[PDB]
Amino acid sequence: MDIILGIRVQDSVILASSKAVTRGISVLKDSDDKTRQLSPHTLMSFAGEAGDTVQFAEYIQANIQLYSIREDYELSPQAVSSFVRQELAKSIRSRRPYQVNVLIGGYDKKKNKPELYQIDYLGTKVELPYGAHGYSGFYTFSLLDHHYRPDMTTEEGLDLLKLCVQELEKRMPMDFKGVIVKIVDKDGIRQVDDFQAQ
Amino acid sequence: GYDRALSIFSPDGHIFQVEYALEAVKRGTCAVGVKGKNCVVLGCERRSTLKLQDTRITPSKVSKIDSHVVLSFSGLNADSRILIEKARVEAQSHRLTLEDPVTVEYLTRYVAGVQQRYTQSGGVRPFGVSTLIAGFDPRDDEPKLYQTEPSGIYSSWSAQTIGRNSKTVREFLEKNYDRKEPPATVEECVKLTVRSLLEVVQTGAKNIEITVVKPDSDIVALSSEEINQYVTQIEQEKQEQ
Amino acid sequence: GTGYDLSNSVFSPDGRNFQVEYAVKAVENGTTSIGIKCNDGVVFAVEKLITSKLLVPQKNVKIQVVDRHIGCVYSGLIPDGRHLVNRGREEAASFKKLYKTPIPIPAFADRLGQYVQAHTLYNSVRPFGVSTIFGGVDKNGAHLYMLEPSGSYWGYKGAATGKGRQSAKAELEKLVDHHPEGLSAREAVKQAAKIIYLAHEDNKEKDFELEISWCSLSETNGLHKFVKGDLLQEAIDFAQKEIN
Amino acid sequence: DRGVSTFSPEGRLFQVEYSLEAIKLGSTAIGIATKEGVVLGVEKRATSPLLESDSIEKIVEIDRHIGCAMSGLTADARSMIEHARTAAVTHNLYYDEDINVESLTQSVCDLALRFGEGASGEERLMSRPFGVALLIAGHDADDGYQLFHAEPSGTFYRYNAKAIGSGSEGAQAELLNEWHSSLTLKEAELLVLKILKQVMEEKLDENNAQLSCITKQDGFKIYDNEKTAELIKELKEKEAAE
Amino acid sequence: MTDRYSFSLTTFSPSGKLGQIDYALTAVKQGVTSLGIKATNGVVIATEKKSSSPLAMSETLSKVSLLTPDIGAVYSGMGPDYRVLVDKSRKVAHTSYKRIYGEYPPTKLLVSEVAKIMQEATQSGGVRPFGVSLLIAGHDEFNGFSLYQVDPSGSYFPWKATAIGKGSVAAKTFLEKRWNDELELEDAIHIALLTLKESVEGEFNGDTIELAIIGDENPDLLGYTGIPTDKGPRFRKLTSQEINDRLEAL
Amino acid sequence: GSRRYDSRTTIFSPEGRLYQVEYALESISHAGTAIGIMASDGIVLAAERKVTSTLLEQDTSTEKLYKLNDKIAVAVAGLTADAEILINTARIHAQNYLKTYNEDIPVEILVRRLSDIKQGYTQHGGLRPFGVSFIYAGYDDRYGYQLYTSNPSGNYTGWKAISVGANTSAAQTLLQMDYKDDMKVDDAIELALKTLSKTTDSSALTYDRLEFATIRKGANDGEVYQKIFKPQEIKDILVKTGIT
Amino acid sequence: AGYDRHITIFSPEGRLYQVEYAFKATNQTNINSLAVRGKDCTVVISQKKVPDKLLDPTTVSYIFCISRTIGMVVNGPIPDARNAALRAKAEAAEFRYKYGYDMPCDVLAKRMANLSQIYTQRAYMRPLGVILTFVSVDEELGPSIYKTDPAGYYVGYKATATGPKQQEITTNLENHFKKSKIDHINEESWEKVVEFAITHMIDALGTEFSKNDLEVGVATKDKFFTLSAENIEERLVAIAEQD
Amino acid sequence: QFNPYGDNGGTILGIAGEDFAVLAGDTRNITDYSINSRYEPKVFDCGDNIVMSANGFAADGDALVKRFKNSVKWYHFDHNDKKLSINSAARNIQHLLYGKRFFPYYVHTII
Amino acid sequence: FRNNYDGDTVTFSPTGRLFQVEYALEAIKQGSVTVGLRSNTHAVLVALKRNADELSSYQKKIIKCDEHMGLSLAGLAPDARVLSNYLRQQCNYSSLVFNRKLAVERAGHLLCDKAQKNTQSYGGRPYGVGLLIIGYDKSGAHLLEFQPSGNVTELYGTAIGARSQGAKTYLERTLDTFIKIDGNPDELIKAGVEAISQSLRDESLTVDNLSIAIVGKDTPFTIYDGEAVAKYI
């Protein structure tokens, strides 16, 4: 599967997601952005079944934007994830289930604290300091378990991720063509356009 | 299961339920819209049949269907909610499938269509509403101002008004709006709006709410003061003569 | 108050249902038709007004068959009659499909009865503008029936409806009296031809065309068949003779 | 009350007749067919100087070889045009060719009588008849240039020229004398432009009137204001010329 | 065919009245009187068995019905409407409660259910309000004993004691005079019998009077033994005999 | 057909008004008065029980103050039964929102939904509108204490203090005359009782004829609490405010 | 306004005219019927009037065989009666199928009463202009008589009568019982119970009966059958040798 | 289990000349190793100067040809007897065929 | 009277009439005339097409249902479309399923039963068009007359519409004559045109005003218009 990493530091959430999109024997694209912005302060990365992956992401995005308009308000990260878990939990017992796994990272402007949610296609949600979907966790959790600290700075977090990505590039069989990193904090969502060598 | 044809033709070729829907609009609070050279302004009067309200929560008259388009109306409030909801959803749907937010015209054409449908469908009565839809097309700076009515008809205007005494205020606008030189400033555009509402609101600093829409999702509603200031500067224009 | 006669399933203050009654009027205003029960079957006959020389003679058949042993004839609004026979046909087909044995005349009568009665229950439908005489031979005898718009129906020895119903009834009653042992199919055919001729006096203004059919356990094998050619002429003459 | 699909003693459908009365109140629209093309013209008729006259769309394109003008309750015509466009497109998808103008028209008229509260014949769910008539003009290889008039009655007629709307009985009378089998496209244009001027309450200018045509070569096109403006001038001249 | 009556048959009149409900009530007012009294340890409901012919067997016609083993109902108004309401009530008690919580619904809720049913007949398409008023008496572990009244409007209220039908006005008065918050079941039964007597023209005996009570559990009326927690129904209809004995101490 | 008996509950008067809505409102105007006053530290809901008897059980009663959520409560004016139908769908809505977002439903959101439901019966269905007006008293972490009001038409609005039902005119004037932004719950409780005391069509205002409920955020806690006063609790507050 | 008399909605007095008028319809046939209970049987008597000579007397009846045990006589227009009968038969069969035992007379009555109650409340269904008298010798209640009307009402009787001259038949029976002090005809044979039925029928109507003026149905343990013109004649002959 | 398809063999050929065209096919129809008929025409004339053949599973072939011819008939009814051009016929058939995309006409067709 | 009994088809007048139907019938009489007649080998339909203005076309009155059957309309054009279409399907069905051409007599029964359905149910309206169906089947030539009432009759010849009575009498007279025009179509058509002109009064049948259709023994129902009918004017 694709790499979907997430880590919640002191004042933000960082999402690293591989850029490769392989179909069969050829790597069709090496610049894929496996993420959608649900609201100014909430970002969701995803990995899974070919078509469902994006379809689901865009479907959730559309709904959140609609809610935002209707109530002229931005749902809390928690709210958004509970909405997403419910969607996946429905999809699991449906005719053709959405096989998509997601990471939702957002900054709760009311609580002034960053939050990271991990939800698998079964609608299994759990909140963490750092999470990952698929095999990604197997290679990186021992590192994060080790170097993770609640008070880490956004810069320390990126350093830890870089470390993880390196272990991933070393022991993992597939070339995921590197990752795209994004920060979600009190000021919104921005992309670290320089991780190809940070 | 109820499909009684409520909107039907009469011997003179009229559809009374639609005509009556209009009568409901006449009774609604006035609403006005004027387009500048780089903006559009929406004004609406606030009733006073009962005052002791909680303005913070009491549903406002100008609504956003999206971040770049707004819609005001005159008529039954409850009816307006239904149209606004559908409009907002169609807005998000359009972005989802076309990968581009709706143009003002398109969004107007949609709302109008919804209305027209209620004029020839069984078991339902027409909307007792008329609307002003304003905003800026994506990546476009030319302002847009549209209007719709229960009949389902719609068209764009340089400035227009609907609601009680819209007759009066339209005149004001007809002899105070030069297409040659439309209000080239957000300030002078908003002023012309207030001036038109004053023709009917009869001193109502709290009875007048203005919302200014600029290109690229730049929408903002004025506060009593901001508006109050425009009124003040306008009453002086009169006395100074 | 009033208006009790505008909606179909309404009861007037005297427990009547005017729409049904109004339907009858349509029936009375129609052509005359009759049914004669003989000793081993039944005979059906009907008056066919010849509006002009343009009508292809013998072609516009009015009597209808249901299954292979039931004969139906009606007076009033023709279309309503066909509609009813259509139903009767499905009605019978279903019965034979499930029970194998073709539908017994009585059973069949009730099917039409229930269906017609049905159209007097709601105001969203109109009662049937026809009275139908029908019957045939079954497992135990021959039966003759007449169904009114009210859904009401009974078994008859002889039956008539339409413009000249009174004449017919009168004539039929004579037969009943003058043949306590029972008429024969052969006889009934002629007798019927006569009664149509007589009853045609309440319509003497227009020329008509006779039509007869019969169902006899011995003459037709229990199957409904139309009286054509010789047997027919023989009856026409038998009548034309006693019409003078 | 009374059913919406009831018959009058004179064997007419009330809702349909009344429908035609509303059409009479509608803006004037005129069509002229010629062996060089068909011209469609309409009276914009804005209700206030503040209304941007070009947002008045009473002439629309159904396909490249078919265009139409409306008159009466125009909002009612939207779905009619959607259905028309879909029919044309759909026809092309199935048959790899252009839909015949007549066929397209027939398809539209098919919607007409699909109204009522429960008429036993299918599923005609539409509380009332359409309150708008239509002038469908187009071209097809089998019957060259054609002009049709579709009414809410479901029936449609073909005309060499036809005018519907408030100034119809008058304009039609004009067309009756002005039309001949050898008119040219320009003649037709001026002609439409003229009759519109006669029946229009307003002084016809390139802002309260709109022209359009359809020609085998360039298909259906709506004349922009400048193009018409001149055609109006050319007419003023030819009229003052005697 | 097909019910084309999809619109309400009950609507607001200019004065604000809801005619059909009003008329429904009028129908109730014509109905034989029935009443209910709540004691400290039980409730009693009673009505008159207005035999519409001496040939008719009044037993084969219960105006007092059991809804659940702890709830009974009685009415005033149209018997047929009441009958179907009872069937519906008994069922809703199962479908919307016993089959979910494994226990019978508490008086107030069952009442709420019945009320809903009636309310809908006040607004659903093509129907008329029920032409009856009900007095339901029951007992549930957490609310004890209670007595409610349900009108055609679908409205309901709790009473200490009340009457409906023909002579409700008089009966209500007579009840106010004799009711207190210290009555023992018998006392109420007694008071019921008296109150009912005024409303009765002819014969007044255990064959013309139908009366039921909601009191102690009747293990003798359970039908089986072995389960301690199951002690029997609190609802018991008095026998023709049981009524007469009390009529002597009238 | 049926069309004959169809009232057409969803049409416009030539004046563009909704007959049924208007009439239903008239219905409401005869219902016991209900008041809602919003103080800086809480909200007060007060209602006058229409019609009562000595035997009426008031401990088990609740005909005007209903709990929707742990943070939202409504005061009813009009058809109790209709109200309940709505109250229930209101309650379900709150729970759905909770299950979907794991956050209590913001007051306006709930109010709007319920209002739209009413609006529906106004534009389609051929059914009669609900003869009910609600006063919504609730709290959420976005606007805190809010007071809303909805009627049969499907319209709703926010207030600092408002009344519904009988003599709303008198009531509104009295409230508008003594209401102040900086008010305190205890002040509102009093103002409420006074207003009702001066609008009642009954002799005096006794506890047996009142329902009282307050939504405060007990300082000694930090959360929102709803308190529906008991007969005894009303009898008290009634004496204290000096009405004995 | 005035339409509160065409459909089943309340009149301002709280009445349902349509139900009342339906009741009227029940007498349209101008036929009286009555039922009484024997020691172990139930009998129903009904007048049989065949005016048209062209009618086949054997196909003219208002007494039906709902089930092997239930017997139903109808007072009202034949079409509604046959409608009611069919439904009743269908209901009886289904009930057996679903529950494993014969539907009790009183139950079938209640069921039919309920169906009628519906036409009383729903506006698209008109009531049936009939009055149904069901009888049988229930396996739990014994001889049973249960009758329903267009109002949806129903109840059991010791004996009952229906028709234009119902009142006389009733008071006649009423009296005989005030006398006998029992709620049934203390007879062991149904032949005698039938004779009693026919007798008291004559006294009340003040009319003599041939063997083609009556229609008789008899319910017994496990069976309900109708008598023939000849089985009737036998009855008529016996009563004769007593007067 | 029941198999909805079968193979009646046979072969068809279609060649287009500058101002003519031919569609040939043998007249043998078989099942496995047996011959069902030595003469069962496989190529048909469908009007508007069109010849069509749907070789493969006979039942499906006939159903298509039958359905197409009937499509021609209705073409005339719906468009004033207009002739159905070969190109139009083809596009029409594409739809006829794709209509059973998930339960195909087991046939290879040429016109 | 009437006024209280003609609001819909589901109501009977006190005399037993269905005005809504009768009203429908009226729409027929108001419609342009058309005539039908047959011999023992052919069946012909002659129709007078009406025109709005002198700029409008003359509306078609003849519709082909199959190769052996067709009809002419008089009244609401749309309804003829609906009905003729339903007739086309019934033919198509008979052929596809039974490989049997639909009997003209049978086509008539279907048409009748379809019309009857709109005269007994609430909500509908009767069809407002008259139809003359001719066709050659397994029992020779045929001519049918269809009334919205649901009444369909088989005749040798007839006409419906305005002044239709003229031709109807003429035919009733020329009976013995045309019924023998076997083997000669031209003659039957001429005999047809002569019957229709017996109902003229306004104008005289022109080339783009006359419409003729024929079917028979060795003639697949075909329609002749304009120039094609010139040799008959």
UniProtKB/Swiss-Prot annotation, chain B:
The keyword Nucleus applies. Signal peptide: none annotated. The modification Phosphothreonine is found at T58. InterPro entries: Ntn_hydrolases_N, Proteasome_alpha, Proteasome_alpha-type, Proteasome_asu_N, Proteasome_bsu_CS, Proteasome_sua/b. Keywords: Cytoplasm, Nucleus, Phosphoprotein, Proteasome. CDD domains: proteasome_alpha_type_7. It holds the Pfam family Proteasome. It is found in: Cytoplasm; Nucleus. PANTHER family: PROTEASOME SUBUNIT ALPHA/BETA (PTHR11599). Present with 16800 molecules/cell in log phase SD medium. The proteasome degrades poly-ubiquitinated proteins in the cytoplasm and in the nucleus. It is essential for the regulated turnover of proteins and for the removal of misfolded proteins. The proteasome is a multicatalytic proteinase complex that is characterized by its ability to cleave peptides with Arg, Phe, Tyr, Leu, and Glu adjacent to the leaving group at neutral or slightly basic pH. It has an ATP-dependent proteolytic activity. The 26S proteasome consists of a 20S proteasome core and two 19S regulatory subunits. The 20S proteasome core is composed of 28 subunits that are arranged in four stacked rings, resulting in a barrel-shaped structure. The two end rings are each formed by seven alpha subunits, and the two central rings are each formed by seven beta subunits. The catalytic chamber with the active sites is on the inside of the barrel. Interacts with CIC1. NCBIfam families: PRK03996.1. Belongs to the peptidase T1A family.
Curated annotation (Swiss-Prot), chain C:
GO terms for cellular component: nucleus; proteasome complex; proteasome core complex, alpha-subunit complex; proteasome storage granule. One of its GO terms (biological process) is proteasomal ubiquitin-independent protein catabolic process. The keyword Transmembrane does not apply. It comes from the Eukaryota. The proteasome degrades poly-ubiquitinated proteins in the cytoplasm and in the nucleus. It is essential for the regulated turnover of proteins and for the removal of misfolded proteins. The proteasome is a multicatalytic proteinase complex that is characterized by its ability to cleave peptides with Arg, Phe, Tyr, Leu, and Glu adjacent to the leaving group at neutral or slightly basic pH. It has an ATP-dependent proteolytic activity. The gene is PRE10. It is found in: Cytoplasm; Nucleus. Belongs to the peptidase T1A family. The 26S proteasome consists of a 20S proteasome core and two 19S regulatory subunits. The 20S proteasome core is composed of 28 subunits that are arranged in four stacked rings, resulting in a barrel-shaped structure. The two end rings are each formed by seven alpha subunits, and the two central rings are each formed by seven beta subunits. The catalytic chamber with the active sites is on the inside of the barrel. Present with 12000 molecules/cell in log phase SD medium. The keyword Acetylation applies. This is Probable proteasome subunit alpha type-7. GO terms for molecular function: mRNA binding. Keywords: Acetylation, Cytoplasm, Nucleus, Proteasome.
Curated annotation (Swiss-Prot), chain E:
GO terms for biological process: proteasomal ubiquitin-independent protein catabolic process; proteasome-mediated ubiquitin-dependent protein catabolic process. Signal peptide: none annotated. The keyword Cytoplasm applies. Keywords: Cytoplasm, Isopeptide bond, Nucleus, Proteasome, Ubl conjugation. PROSITE patterns: PROTEASOME_ALPHA_1, PROTEASOME_ALPHA_2. There is a cross-link at K108 (Glycyl lysine isopeptide (Lys-Gly) (interchain with G-Cter in ubiquitin)). Its main location: cytoplasm. InterPro entries: Ntn_hydrolases_N (IPR029055), Proteasome_alpha (IPR050115), Proteasome_alpha-type (IPR023332), Proteasome_asu_N (IPR000426), Proteasome_sua/b (IPR001353). The keyword Cytoplasm applies. SUPFAM superfamilies: N-terminal nucleophile aminohydrolases (Ntn hydrolases). Coiled coil: none annotated. CDD domains: proteasome_alpha_type_2. It comes from the Eukaryota. It holds the Pfam family Proteasome_A_N. GO terms for cellular component: nucleus; proteasome complex; proteasome core complex, alpha-subunit complex; proteasome storage granule. It is found in: Cytoplasm; Nucleus. Belongs to the peptidase T1A family. Present with 7060 molecules/cell in log phase SD medium. The proteasome degrades poly-ubiquitinated proteins in the cytoplasm and in the nucleus. It is essential for the regulated turnover of proteins and for the removal of misfolded proteins. The proteasome is a multicatalytic proteinase complex that is characterized by its ability to cleave peptides with Arg, Phe, Tyr, Leu, and Glu adjacent to the leaving group at neutral or slightly basic pH. It has an ATP-dependent proteolytic activity. This is Proteasome subunit alpha type-2. It comes from Saccharomyces cerevisiae (strain ATCC 204508 / S288c). The gene is PRE8.
UniProtKB/Swiss-Prot annotation, chain G:
The keyword Cell cycle does not apply. It is found in: Cytoplasm; Nucleus. Keywords: Acetylation, Cytoplasm, Isopeptide bond, Nucleus, Phosphoprotein, Proteasome, Ubl conjugation. The gene is SCL1. Pfam families: Proteasome, Proteasome_A_N. This is Proteasome subunit alpha type-1. Present with 15200 molecules/cell in log phase SD medium. The 26S proteasome consists of a 20S proteasome core and two 19S regulatory subunits. The 20S proteasome core is composed of 28 subunits that are arranged in four stacked rings, resulting in a barrel-shaped structure. The two end rings are each formed by seven alpha subunits, and the two central rings are each formed by seven beta subunits. The catalytic chamber with the active sites is on the inside of the barrel. Interacts with CIC1. The modification Phosphoserine is found at S228. One of its GO terms (cellular component) is proteasome complex. InterPro entries: Ntn_hydrolases_N, Proteasome_alpha, Proteasome_alpha-type, Proteasome_asu_N, Proteasome_sua/b, Proteasome_subunit_alpha6. There is a cross-link at K223 (Glycyl lysine isopeptide (Lys-Gly) (interchain with G-Cter in ubiquitin)). Its main location: cytoplasm. It comes from Saccharomyces cerevisiae (strain ATCC 204508 / S288c). GO terms for biological process: proteasomal ubiquitin-independent protein catabolic process; proteasome-mediated ubiquitin-dependent protein catabolic process. Belongs to the peptidase T1A family.
